[PDB]
Amino acid sequence: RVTMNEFEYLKLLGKGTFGKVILVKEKATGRYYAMKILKKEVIVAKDEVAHTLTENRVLQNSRHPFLTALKYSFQTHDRLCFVMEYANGGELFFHLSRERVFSEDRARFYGAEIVSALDYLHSEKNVVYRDLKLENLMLDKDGHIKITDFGLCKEGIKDGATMKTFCGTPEYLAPEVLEDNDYGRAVDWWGLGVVMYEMMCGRLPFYNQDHEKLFELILMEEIRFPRTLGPEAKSLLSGLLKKDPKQRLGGGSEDAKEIMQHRFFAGIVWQHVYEKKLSPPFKPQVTSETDTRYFDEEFTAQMSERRPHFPQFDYSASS
Amino acid sequence: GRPRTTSFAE
Ligand SMILES: Cc1nnc(-c2ccccc2Nc2ncnc3[nH]ccc23)[nH]1
Missing domain, CATH: 3.30.200.20 (Phosphorylase Kinase; domain 1)
Known part of the structure:
Protein backbone atom coordinates (compact mmCIF):
# COMPACT_ATOMS: atom_id res chain seq x y z
CA ARG A 1 0.00 0.00 0.00
CA GLU A 91 27.68 10.30 -10.01
CA LEU A 92 30.26 9.55 -12.60
CA PHE A 93 30.11 13.29 -13.44
CA PHE A 94 31.24 13.78 -9.83
CA HIS A 95 34.20 11.38 -10.20
CA LEU A 96 35.32 12.52 -13.69
CA SER A 97 35.17 16.12 -12.34
CA ARG A 98 37.70 15.32 -9.61
CA GLU A 99 40.03 13.14 -11.77
CA ARG A 100 39.66 15.07 -15.09
CA VAL A 101 40.47 11.94 -17.01
CA PHE A 102 40.09 8.20 -16.64
CA SER A 103 42.67 5.58 -17.65
CA GLU A 104 42.01 3.62 -20.70
CA ASP A 105 41.43 0.52 -18.46
CA ARG A 106 38.92 2.35 -16.37
CA ALA A 107 37.07 3.94 -19.37
CA ARG A 108 37.13 0.39 -20.89
CA PHE A 109 35.47 -1.16 -17.79
CA TYR A 110 32.62 1.38 -17.71
CA GLY A 111 32.12 1.33 -21.43
CA ALA A 112 31.91 -2.44 -21.41
CA GLU A 113 29.11 -2.13 -18.88
CA ILE A 114 27.29 0.54 -20.76
CA VAL A 115 27.44 -1.56 -23.99
CA SER A 116 26.13 -4.57 -21.97
CA ALA A 117 23.05 -2.68 -20.79
CA LEU A 118 22.40 -0.94 -24.06
CA ASP A 119 22.70 -4.17 -25.99
CA TYR A 120 20.10 -5.44 -23.49
CA LEU A 121 17.69 -2.42 -23.97
CA HIS A 122 18.01 -2.75 -27.75
CA SER A 123 17.90 -6.47 -28.43
CA GLU A 124 15.64 -7.55 -25.43
CA LYS A 125 13.38 -4.61 -24.68
CA ASN A 126 13.40 -3.02 -28.14
CA VAL A 127 14.21 0.28 -26.35
CA VAL A 128 16.48 3.05 -27.53
CA TYR A 129 17.72 5.07 -24.57
CA ARG A 130 18.31 8.32 -26.44
CA ASP A 131 19.86 10.33 -23.64
CA LEU A 132 23.22 8.75 -22.82
CA LYS A 133 25.30 11.30 -20.97
CA LEU A 134 27.78 11.31 -18.16
CA GLU A 135 25.12 12.82 -15.88
CA ASN A 136 22.87 9.77 -16.22
CA LEU A 137 25.59 7.42 -15.04
CA MET A 138 25.88 6.37 -11.44
CA LEU A 139 28.20 3.96 -9.57
CA ASP A 140 27.03 1.30 -6.99
CA LYS A 141 28.80 0.30 -3.71
CA ASP A 142 31.17 -2.04 -5.67
CA GLY A 143 31.94 0.47 -8.58
CA HIS A 144 29.69 -0.95 -11.28
CA ILE A 145 27.80 1.37 -13.64
CA LYS A 146 24.17 2.23 -13.19
CA ILE A 147 22.29 3.95 -15.93
CA THR A 148 19.27 5.93 -14.74
CA ASP A 149 16.52 8.11 -16.15
CA PHE A 150 14.30 6.54 -18.80
CA GLY A 151 11.94 9.45 -19.72
CA LEU A 152 13.40 10.03 -23.21
CA CYS A 153 13.51 6.30 -24.20
CA LYS A 154 11.82 5.20 -27.36
CA GLU A 155 9.75 1.98 -26.93
CA GLY A 156 8.83 -0.57 -29.59
CA ILE A 157 11.92 -0.07 -31.83
CA LYS A 158 13.08 -3.29 -33.42
CA ASP A 159 15.66 -3.73 -36.22
CA GLY A 160 16.40 -0.42 -38.03
CA ALA A 161 12.93 0.95 -37.22
CA THR A 162 13.17 4.76 -36.94
CA MET A 163 12.05 7.74 -34.88
CA LYS A 164 11.72 11.50 -35.37
CA THR A 165 11.38 13.20 -31.99
CA PHE A 166 13.94 15.77 -31.52
CA CYS A 167 15.21 15.19 -28.08
CA GLY A 168 18.24 14.29 -25.95
CA THR A 169 20.86 16.69 -24.57
CA PRO A 170 22.32 19.36 -26.95
CA GLU A 171 25.90 18.40 -26.37
CA TYR A 172 25.29 14.69 -27.17
CA LEU A 173 22.96 14.85 -30.13
CA ALA A 174 24.00 12.74 -33.00
CA PRO A 175 24.39 14.29 -36.47
CA GLU A 176 21.51 12.46 -38.12
CA VAL A 177 19.32 13.93 -35.44
CA LEU A 178 20.56 17.48 -35.91
CA GLU A 179 19.93 16.80 -39.67
CA ASP A 180 16.25 16.46 -39.06
CA ASN A 181 16.45 12.96 -40.58
CA ASP A 182 14.58 9.87 -39.26
CA TYR A 183 16.97 8.03 -36.98
CA GLY A 184 17.28 4.55 -35.44
CA ARG A 185 19.24 2.92 -32.66
CA ALA A 186 22.73 3.89 -33.74
CA VAL A 187 22.09 7.14 -31.83
CA ASP A 188 22.88 5.27 -28.63
CA TRP A 189 26.25 4.35 -30.07
CA TRP A 190 27.02 7.98 -30.93
CA GLY A 191 26.19 8.89 -27.38
CA LEU A 192 28.53 6.21 -26.19
CA GLY A 193 31.41 7.76 -28.34
CA VAL A 194 30.86 11.12 -26.58
CA VAL A 195 30.96 9.56 -23.15
CA MET A 196 33.99 7.40 -23.86
CA TYR A 197 35.66 10.47 -25.50
CA GLU A 198 34.92 12.42 -22.31
CA MET A 199 36.32 9.79 -20.08
CA MET A 200 39.58 9.24 -21.95
CA CYS A 201 40.15 12.78 -23.26
CA GLY A 202 38.87 15.08 -20.50
CA ARG A 203 36.51 17.17 -22.52
CA LEU A 204 33.48 16.78 -24.75
CA PRO A 205 34.30 16.26 -28.43
CA PHE A 206 32.07 19.18 -29.44
CA TYR A 207 31.66 22.20 -27.22
CA ASN A 208 30.23 25.71 -27.56
CA GLN A 209 27.75 27.36 -25.23
CA ASP A 210 26.20 28.74 -28.38
CA HIS A 211 24.02 25.99 -29.75
CA GLU A 212 24.01 27.12 -33.35
CA LYS A 213 27.80 26.91 -33.13
CA LEU A 214 27.56 23.72 -31.07
CA PHE A 215 25.39 22.04 -33.77
CA GLU A 216 27.57 23.18 -36.62
CA LEU A 217 30.58 21.52 -34.91
CA ILE A 218 28.74 18.21 -34.45
CA LEU A 219 27.88 18.34 -38.22
CA MET A 220 30.98 19.89 -39.79
CA GLU A 221 34.12 18.99 -37.80
CA GLU A 222 36.22 15.90 -37.12
CA ILE A 223 37.12 15.05 -33.58
CA ARG A 224 40.54 15.88 -32.18
CA PHE A 225 42.52 13.08 -30.79
CA PRO A 226 44.86 13.95 -27.86
CA ARG A 227 48.35 12.44 -28.34
CA THR A 228 47.86 10.32 -25.12
CA LEU A 229 45.32 8.06 -26.88
CA GLY A 230 46.42 4.64 -27.90
CA PRO A 231 45.71 3.45 -31.40
CA GLU A 232 42.86 1.12 -30.27
CA ALA A 233 41.24 4.00 -28.41
CA LYS A 234 41.62 6.45 -31.47
CA SER A 235 39.95 3.74 -33.43
CA LEU A 236 36.91 3.06 -31.14
CA LEU A 237 36.13 6.81 -30.74
CA SER A 238 36.65 7.42 -34.45
CA GLY A 239 34.26 4.61 -35.30
CA LEU A 240 31.65 5.45 -32.61
CA LEU A 241 31.56 9.06 -33.86
CA LYS A 242 31.12 8.46 -37.53
CA LYS A 243 28.57 11.08 -38.43
CA ASP A 244 26.84 8.82 -40.87
CA PRO A 245 24.88 6.25 -38.69
CA LYS A 246 25.30 3.81 -41.67
CA GLN A 247 29.11 3.96 -41.23
CA ARG A 248 29.02 4.02 -37.44
CA LEU A 249 30.29 1.10 -35.26
CA GLY A 250 27.09 -0.57 -33.94
CA GLY A 251 25.04 0.83 -36.80
CA GLY A 252 24.66 -2.24 -39.04
CA SER A 253 22.30 -5.16 -38.32
CA GLU A 254 24.56 -6.59 -35.62
CA ASP A 255 24.26 -3.49 -33.36
CA ALA A 256 26.19 -3.85 -30.01
CA LYS A 257 28.03 -6.90 -31.34
CA GLU A 258 30.08 -4.75 -33.78
CA ILE A 259 31.28 -2.87 -30.68
CA MET A 260 32.02 -5.95 -28.52
CA GLN A 261 34.29 -7.33 -31.24
CA HIS A 262 36.27 -4.09 -31.62
CA ARG A 263 39.99 -4.38 -30.66
CA PHE A 264 39.65 -1.76 -27.95
CA PHE A 265 37.63 -4.47 -26.00
CA ALA A 266 39.98 -7.27 -26.87
CA GLY A 267 40.16 -9.72 -23.88
CA ILE A 268 37.08 -8.31 -22.34
CA VAL A 269 34.92 -11.34 -21.77
CA TRP A 270 31.37 -10.22 -22.30
CA GLN A 271 29.51 -12.85 -20.24
CA HIS A 272 31.91 -12.03 -17.34
CA VAL A 273 31.01 -8.28 -17.64
CA TYR A 274 27.38 -9.24 -17.42
CA GLU A 275 27.93 -11.66 -14.47
CA LYS A 276 30.04 -8.97 -12.67
CA LYS A 277 33.16 -11.06 -12.37
CA LEU A 278 35.52 -8.24 -13.45
CA SER A 279 37.20 -6.13 -10.78
CA PRO A 280 35.93 -2.53 -10.70
CA PRO A 281 39.04 -0.43 -11.06
CA PHE A 282 37.64 1.86 -8.41
CA LYS A 283 35.85 0.55 -5.33
CA PRO A 284 33.97 3.49 -3.78
CA GLN A 285 35.15 4.03 -0.18
CA GLY B 1 34.99 22.36 -13.95
CA ARG B 2 32.46 21.37 -16.77
CA PRO B 3 28.87 22.64 -16.29
CA ARG B 4 25.99 20.17 -16.12
CA THR B 5 23.99 19.83 -19.31
CA THR B 6 20.21 19.73 -19.60
CA SER B 7 18.02 17.21 -21.35
CA PHE B 8 15.14 18.51 -23.45
CA ALA B 9 12.39 17.26 -25.69
CA GLU B 10 10.80 19.34 -28.43
C1 LIG C 1 18.58 12.04 -14.29
C2 LIG C 1 18.93 11.66 -12.89
N1 LIG C 1 18.32 10.83 -12.08
N2 LIG C 1 19.00 10.83 -10.97
C3 LIG C 1 20.05 11.64 -11.02
C4 LIG C 1 21.07 11.92 -9.97
C5 LIG C 1 21.82 13.09 -10.04
C6 LIG C 1 22.74 13.44 -9.08
C7 LIG C 1 22.93 12.58 -8.03
C8 LIG C 1 22.19 11.43 -7.91
C9 LIG C 1 21.26 11.06 -8.86
N3 LIG C 1 20.51 9.88 -8.78
C10 LIG C 1 20.82 8.73 -8.04
N4 LIG C 1 21.79 8.65 -7.14
C11 LIG C 1 21.99 7.55 -6.42
N5 LIG C 1 21.34 6.42 -6.59
C12 LIG C 1 20.35 6.36 -7.48
N6 LIG C 1 19.54 5.37 -7.91
C13 LIG C 1 18.73 5.83 -8.91
C14 LIG C 1 19.01 7.12 -9.14
C15 LIG C 1 20.07 7.52 -8.26
N7 LIG C 1 20.00 12.19 -12.27
Missing part, protein backbone atom coordinates in the same frame (compact mmCIF):
# COMPACT_ATOMS: atom_id res chain seq x y z
CA VAL A 2 3.02 2.57 -0.23
CA THR A 3 2.99 6.40 0.40
CA MET A 4 5.47 9.14 1.50
CA ASN A 5 4.91 8.38 5.19
CA GLU A 6 6.61 4.96 4.60
CA PHE A 7 10.04 6.54 4.21
CA GLU A 8 12.37 8.89 6.14
CA TYR A 9 13.99 11.68 4.07
CA LEU A 10 17.72 11.89 4.79
CA LYS A 11 19.72 13.60 2.03
CA LEU A 12 19.26 15.52 -1.19
CA LEU A 13 21.60 13.83 -3.67
CA GLY A 14 20.61 15.87 -6.73
CA LYS A 15 18.22 18.30 -8.40
CA GLY A 16 17.20 19.70 -11.77
CA THR A 17 15.25 19.12 -14.99
CA PHE A 18 14.57 15.61 -13.64
CA GLY A 19 12.91 16.69 -10.34
CA LYS A 20 14.58 15.95 -7.01
CA VAL A 21 16.41 12.77 -5.94
CA ILE A 22 16.56 11.91 -2.24
CA LEU A 23 18.36 9.19 -0.22
CA VAL A 24 15.38 7.71 1.76
CA LYS A 25 14.99 4.81 4.26
CA GLU A 26 12.03 2.41 4.05
CA LYS A 27 10.44 2.40 7.58
CA ALA A 28 9.26 -1.22 7.53
CA THR A 29 12.54 -2.71 6.24
CA GLY A 30 15.29 -0.29 7.16
CA ARG A 31 16.44 -0.34 3.52
CA TYR A 32 17.88 2.61 1.68
CA TYR A 33 16.72 3.90 -1.73
CA ALA A 34 16.96 6.88 -4.09
CA MET A 35 13.53 8.43 -4.47
CA LYS A 36 13.09 10.57 -7.60
CA ILE A 37 10.12 12.87 -6.92
CA LEU A 38 8.37 14.88 -9.59
CA LYS A 39 5.64 17.47 -9.19
CA LYS A 40 2.56 16.51 -11.30
CA GLU A 41 2.22 20.21 -12.17
CA VAL A 42 5.52 20.74 -14.01
CA ILE A 43 4.85 17.54 -15.96
CA VAL A 44 1.55 18.65 -17.47
CA ALA A 45 2.95 22.14 -17.92
CA LYS A 46 5.72 20.71 -20.20
CA ASP A 47 3.22 18.47 -22.10
CA GLU A 48 5.18 15.38 -21.05
CA VAL A 49 3.11 12.93 -19.03
CA ALA A 50 4.02 10.53 -21.84
CA HIS A 51 7.75 10.58 -20.77
CA THR A 52 6.80 9.56 -17.26
CA LEU A 53 4.65 6.65 -18.39
CA THR A 54 7.51 5.63 -20.71
CA GLU A 55 9.97 5.74 -17.86
CA ASN A 56 7.64 3.88 -15.47
CA ARG A 57 7.15 1.12 -18.02
CA VAL A 58 10.77 0.88 -19.08
CA LEU A 59 11.83 0.52 -15.46
CA GLN A 60 9.17 -2.20 -14.66
CA ASN A 61 10.17 -4.37 -17.59
CA SER A 62 14.01 -4.05 -17.27
CA ARG A 63 16.11 -6.32 -15.14
CA HIS A 64 19.80 -5.68 -15.87
CA PRO A 65 22.84 -5.19 -13.64
CA PHE A 66 23.85 -1.77 -15.09
CA LEU A 67 20.35 -0.26 -15.03
CA THR A 68 18.95 1.02 -11.70
CA ALA A 69 16.13 -1.21 -10.39
CA LEU A 70 12.70 0.06 -9.43
CA LYS A 71 11.23 -1.17 -6.13
CA TYR A 72 8.14 1.15 -6.04
CA SER A 73 6.27 3.66 -8.16
CA PHE A 74 3.54 5.50 -6.27
CA GLN A 75 1.86 8.80 -6.76
CA THR A 76 0.20 11.22 -4.45
CA HIS A 77 -2.23 14.04 -5.06
CA ASP A 78 0.63 16.39 -5.98
CA ARG A 79 3.66 14.13 -6.75
CA LEU A 80 4.99 11.13 -8.75
CA CYS A 81 7.65 9.07 -6.99
CA PHE A 82 10.05 6.37 -8.20
CA VAL A 83 11.76 4.53 -5.35
CA MET A 84 14.84 3.03 -7.02
CA GLU A 85 17.78 1.03 -5.89
CA TYR A 86 20.36 3.41 -4.35
CA ALA A 87 23.76 3.85 -6.16
CA ASN A 88 26.04 4.42 -3.32
CA GLY A 89 29.25 5.19 -5.22
CA GLY A 90 27.80 8.46 -6.66
CA VAL A 286 31.94 4.44 1.70
CA THR A 287 31.79 4.20 5.43
CA SER A 288 28.11 3.13 5.79
CA GLU A 289 25.00 3.45 3.51
CA THR A 290 24.31 6.94 4.60
CA ASP A 291 27.73 8.22 3.54
CA THR A 292 27.53 10.61 0.58
CA ARG A 293 31.13 11.71 -0.02
CA TYR A 294 30.69 10.93 -3.79
CA PHE A 295 27.63 13.12 -4.22
CA ASP A 296 27.99 16.79 -5.05
CA GLU A 297 27.66 19.30 -2.19
CA GLU A 298 25.49 22.04 -3.72
CA PHE A 299 22.85 19.30 -2.99
CA THR A 300 24.02 17.13 0.01
CA ALA A 301 24.17 20.45 1.90
CA GLN A 302 20.63 21.77 1.12
CA MET A 303 19.23 19.14 3.49
CA SER A 304 -7.19 21.02 -10.57
CA GLU A 305 -6.52 18.98 -13.80
CA ARG A 306 -2.91 20.24 -13.81
CA ARG A 307 -2.72 17.70 -10.96
CA PRO A 308 -4.46 14.60 -12.49
CA HIS A 309 -4.47 10.93 -11.72
CA PHE A 310 -1.79 9.01 -13.65
CA PRO A 311 -3.50 5.70 -14.36
CA GLN A 312 -1.89 2.46 -13.22
CA PHE A 313 1.21 4.39 -12.27
CA ASP A 314 1.63 2.64 -8.98
CA TYR A 315 3.91 -0.42 -8.89
CA SER A 316 5.70 -2.79 -6.41
CA ALA A 317 8.37 -5.30 -7.51
CA SER A 318 8.30 -9.16 -7.08
CA SER A 319 10.38 -11.09 -9.76
